[PDB]
């Protein structure tokens, strides 16, 4: 339910 | 300043070692020391600063969410006393202190010296992100102002990114991804979040043909995050 | 003592919250505060103390192993300067300080007040474990003495466990598992490690018929760790 | 290659 913010590969 | 006696290059080298060891608190302290040397940061050094603090604050946010959920269930319930609130407040104050530290590095003096679009957009995105993490825990007189500070930093970064960077640039993509999360989660603007994610994805799609194989991989990885949010939200 | 003003029960409650939040440093500081109240610990409280410190020192040991491996490869190689050694030494000194803190709680005064076999064996096993973690990083004049201190604590715990506990007791099993790791990794005694693991497994097997379903599950889980080591070592 | 010491389920 929480969305994706930018994160490392 | 704890790291004042260590050479800049040694702080950078130790931040890379701390990353390999998954010692993110140490990594962030090394990178704070490097910023405080007063010189501008290179691309790779900006990435080390961001990885360090995002991992420290990410662990804090995950712990705050566990504690906040227990506190809310306690408020539905046998009264356990003040401990759940006290400990959630402890973790919250720690998190706020880490966000204030990062914001302070950006204001003294990383943003004002950042003239190239890649550095200035990177730092303004970080400024939006750390005000967003402040907004996630904010409840008092300044909550609207914290949200506006995030919005204003993201908006300045968007304006520069649209004028100076291609639509596939990874920093431009990550900025748009995070501003779209801000709209959805913080500003109560899910339609703005969805519109921004869709327009960003489509404009990047149309520019992939200009890229090398390695740049294509970088851009498509972030595009997939935009699509994952669109799938969650629609 | 940082936690001196907090109630014992509030420190225990906060250690449980910190566990749920995966805040193991905080968990260990709460449990240190609880021990320093001076009362004996219950079974559940001993488990919270051990989980807290094993997770803190486990992260330190994992980081030390990454750094030690980089330092050894650097010593095979272009000279990177003193930073890898310095940072490995930093992590090592931190780890030693955490081990010294736990050993100090056991010596002041948990072991001397522990009269029941379950508590006394639990604490002596911890004493063996934290001297074992000291031995993993030890290189100087006291290395043999650190190894002997681990051996002596494990041996006293074994002697009590064999006289006072059934061969399936989970603390007796975990103690034998860890003493067998001590023999293999620290004391250069792989045959002693293998013999201890086999005899412990077989004597537990023979006593499973006395157990309830839940006690059977507890004992067989640890027996599987003994068998995993035997498979690795033979 | 590293062996298992006691750990939580
Ligand atoms: C916020 C953000 C977005 C994109 C990247 N990046 C650069 C190259 N690949 C991905 C970073 Cl480092 C940070
Ligand atoms: C060292 C050790 C061994 C076994 C247990 N245990 C108790 C109940 N199940 C497993 C602990 Cl807590 C610690
Ligand atoms: Ca210098
Ligand atoms: Ca607060
Ligand atoms: Ca500049
Ligand atoms: Ca450009
Ligand atoms: Ca009291
Ligand atoms: Ca040393
Ligand atoms: Ca007693
Ligand atoms: Ca008994
Ligand atoms: Cl607290
Ligand atoms: Cl160091």
Summarize the structure.
With 9 residues, chain A is low in regular secondary structure. Helix content of chain A is 0%, strand content 0%. Chain B has one domain (8-234): 14-3-3 domain (Delta-Endotoxin, domain 1), CATH 1.20.190.
CATH class annotation of chain B: Mainly Alpha
- Distance N terminus to C terminus of chain A? 20 Å
Largest beta-sheet characterization of chain B: none
Structural class of chain A: little secondary structure
Oligomer: heterotetramer
User: How large is the share of residues in beta strands of chain A?
Assistant: under 5%
Count of structural domains of chain B: 1
Gross morphology of chain A is elongated
Ligands: 3-chloranyl-4-imidazol-1-yl-benzaldehyde, calcium ion, chloride ion
CATH topology of chain B: Delta-Endotoxin, domain 1
Helix run count of chain B? 9
CATH homologous superfamily title of chain B: 14-3-3 domain
Q: Please compute the radius of gyration of chain A using only Cα atoms.
A: 7 Å
Rg calc of chain B: 19 Å
Structure summary, number of beta strands of chain A: 0
Helix content of chain A: under 10%
Biggest interface found: B-C, 24 and 24 residues
Modified residues (Phosphoserine) (chains B, C): 10, 77
Subcellular location (chains B, C): Cytoplasm; Nucleus; Secreted
Pfam family, one (chains B, C): 14-3-3
Organism (chains B, C): Homo sapiens
Which tags fit this structure?
heterotetramer; A: 9 residues; little secondary structure; 0% strand; B: mainly alpha; Delta-Endotoxin, domain 1; 9 helices; 79% helix; binds 3-chloranyl-4-imidazol-1-yl-benzaldehyde; binds calcium ion; Peptidyl-prolyl cis-trans isomerase NIMA-interacting 1 (chains A, D); phosphoprotein (chains B, C); ubl conjugation (chains B, C)
